Design a protein around this ligand. Structure first.
Ligand SMILES: Cc1cc2nc3c(=O)[nH]c(=O)nc-3n(C[C@H](O)[C@H](O)[C@H](O)COP(=O)(O)O)c2cc1C
Ligand SMILES: *P(=O)(O)OCC(C)(C)[C@@H](O)C(=O)NCCC(=O)NCCSC(=O)CCCCCCC
Ligand code: SF4
Lengths: 72, 366
């Protein structure tokens, strides 16, 4: 819960969307309006604030915010 | 009247040098294979073998499973056996001159095809259709192969240089900047395309500027470059080289033989920007599948090859109207009613089909 809101605030700030609509089912591209460049940036932004790597082979599998949350 | 020597300077990319600063852009399916890229390399530019949909090579000669007369799954569509043969046949013509391999990042089995491409003998990997953030991961056994992403903005350069250095302490040996006049898929805002800001004469200064901050990465301009005058324009704007596809699409050595019949008839009114399962706009010729869709006569969509990941096996193909693996595959096979055909914006200017040698002469003389 503490983790989910921290990474919620980061997604909302990166993609310029309301935190209230950054829900576990929300897809970054379909639902939150981000392109490829936005997602890579977001992945880089998460890596810093949490000191992990998320190799591309998992980033290809995350798709929505809830999957990102679990990986962390 | 005699052939005349160039004042163009040789171009060096990573460990490899080409006599003219010219890439022949990769073109799938079966468009820039052995004949086209081998002869380009023979003539002193970069020949670039497209590695997408190679299972179609020699009418699926090298596939091991066929379903609906189409290569079944990425394992067969991106055939290691076929790709090695094309490199084998390309080296017949060009010897050990440098050959690129082109691989969309969108495809399934991306990593496998890059190592198949290195193992086939490629000297340079070229990757667009996506932001290839992990490209050195798959090339790690092949420190001689240069890696060249395709980008359409300075932002993409900055992003990729940061990831590759963070992760690998490596930087791309070159970047191809592709403008909105290009053939195939666009690196551009679905909407934008004709805005003044995105014009290639404007991108190249911006990308070269950004490239200075990372050790002066060589920037290759592509999209709408027609003749030596266009070449000189791009070089004067900071580019180290140009990539060109439509002019080579109109040569005899083009491996997709249907294009020699099609291009002399092509009119500007039949070049159109369409939707694609890959997820990017594509510049296509209003013929083949594109006519069959508007007629209501379009072939059936049943994902057999599973060429690209963004499609989710029919979901995007059914919504756009066509399977791009099947449509490009049929074109290589001569199917004019229901093949898919691409071109750059300059394709209507292709009036006569000439040879690679004659094209190379036009572009480099003086
Ligand atoms: C028929 C055709 C197929 C293409 N296929 C690919 C491809 O498979 N991979 C790629 O990176 N670019 C592809 N392109 C883009 C070219 O490699 C090149 O970047 C662009 O066409 C250059 O612009 P020009 O055609 O105006 O010279 C294709 C272009 C054409 C015309
Ligand atoms: P993201 O949304 O995925 O955003 C990525 C982005 C912005 C498009 C970049 O990768 C970028 O700047 N790209 C330039 C890539 C290219 O412009 N071009 C190479 C495209 S591959 C191609 O043109 C056609 C392929 C034809 C054959 C299809 C075979 C199945
Ligand atoms: S249905 Fe989609 S994934 Fe399958 S071959 Fe066609 S374009 Fe590729």
């Amino acid at each position: 819960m503490a983790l989910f809101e921290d990474i919620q605030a980061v997604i909302a700030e990166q993609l310029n969307v309301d935190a209230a609509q950054v829900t576990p089912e929300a897809e970054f591209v379909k639902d939150l309006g981000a392109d490829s460049l936005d997602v890579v940036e977001l992945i880089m932004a998460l890596e810093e604030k949490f000191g992990i790597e998320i190799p591309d082979e998992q980033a290809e599998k995350i798709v929505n915010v809830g999957d990102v949350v679990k990986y962390i | 009247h005699h052939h005349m020597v160039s004042t163009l300077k040789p171009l060096k990319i990573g460990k490899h040098t080409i006599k003219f600063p010219i890439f022949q852009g990769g073109m799938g399916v079966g468009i820039s294979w052995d004949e086209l890229a081998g002869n380009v390399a023979k003539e002193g530019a970069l020949g670039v073998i497209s590695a997408v949909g190679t299972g179609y090579y020699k009418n699926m000669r090298f596939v091991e499973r066929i379903v609906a007369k189409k290569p079944f799954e990425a394992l067969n569509f991106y055939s290691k056996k076929a790709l090695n043969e094309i490199f084998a046949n390309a080296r017949k013509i060009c010897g050990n001159n440098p050959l690129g391999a082109n691989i969309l990042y969108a495809i399934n089995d991306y990593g496998r095809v890059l190592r198949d491409s290195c193992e086939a003998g490629a000297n340079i990997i070229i990757t667009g259709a996506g932001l290839p953030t992990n490209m050195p991961e798959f090339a790690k056994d092949f420190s001689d192969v240069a890696l060249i992403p395709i980008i359409s903005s300075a932002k993409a350069l900055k992003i990729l240089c940061k990831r590759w250095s963070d992760r690998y302490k490596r930087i791309p040996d070159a970047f191809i900047v592709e403008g909105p006049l290009s053939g195939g898929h666009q690196g551009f805002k679905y909407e934008d395309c004709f805005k003044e800001e995105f014009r290639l004469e404007n991108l190249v200064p911006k990308v070269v500027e950004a490239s200075k901050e990372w050790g002066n990465i060589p920037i290759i301009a592509a999209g709408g470059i027609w003749d030596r005058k266009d070449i000189d324009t791009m070089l004067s704007l900071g580019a180290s080289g140009v990539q060109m596809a439509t002019r080579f699409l109109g040569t005899k050595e083009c491996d997709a033989k249907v294009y020699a019949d099609l291009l002399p008839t092509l009119k500007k009114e039949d070049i159109l920007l369409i939707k694609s399962p890959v997820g990017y706009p594509a510049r296509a010729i209003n013929t083949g599948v594109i006519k069959r869709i508007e007629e209501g006569n379009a072939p059936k969509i049943a994902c057999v090859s599973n060429c690209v990941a963004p499609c989710n096996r029919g979901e995007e193909a059914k919504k756009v109207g066509y399977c791009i693996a099947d449509g490009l595959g049929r074109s290589y096979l001569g199917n004019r009613e229901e093949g898919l055909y691409f071109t750059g914006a300059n394709g209507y200017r292709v009036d006569k089909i000439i040879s690679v040698h004659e094209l190379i002469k036009e572009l480099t003389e003086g």
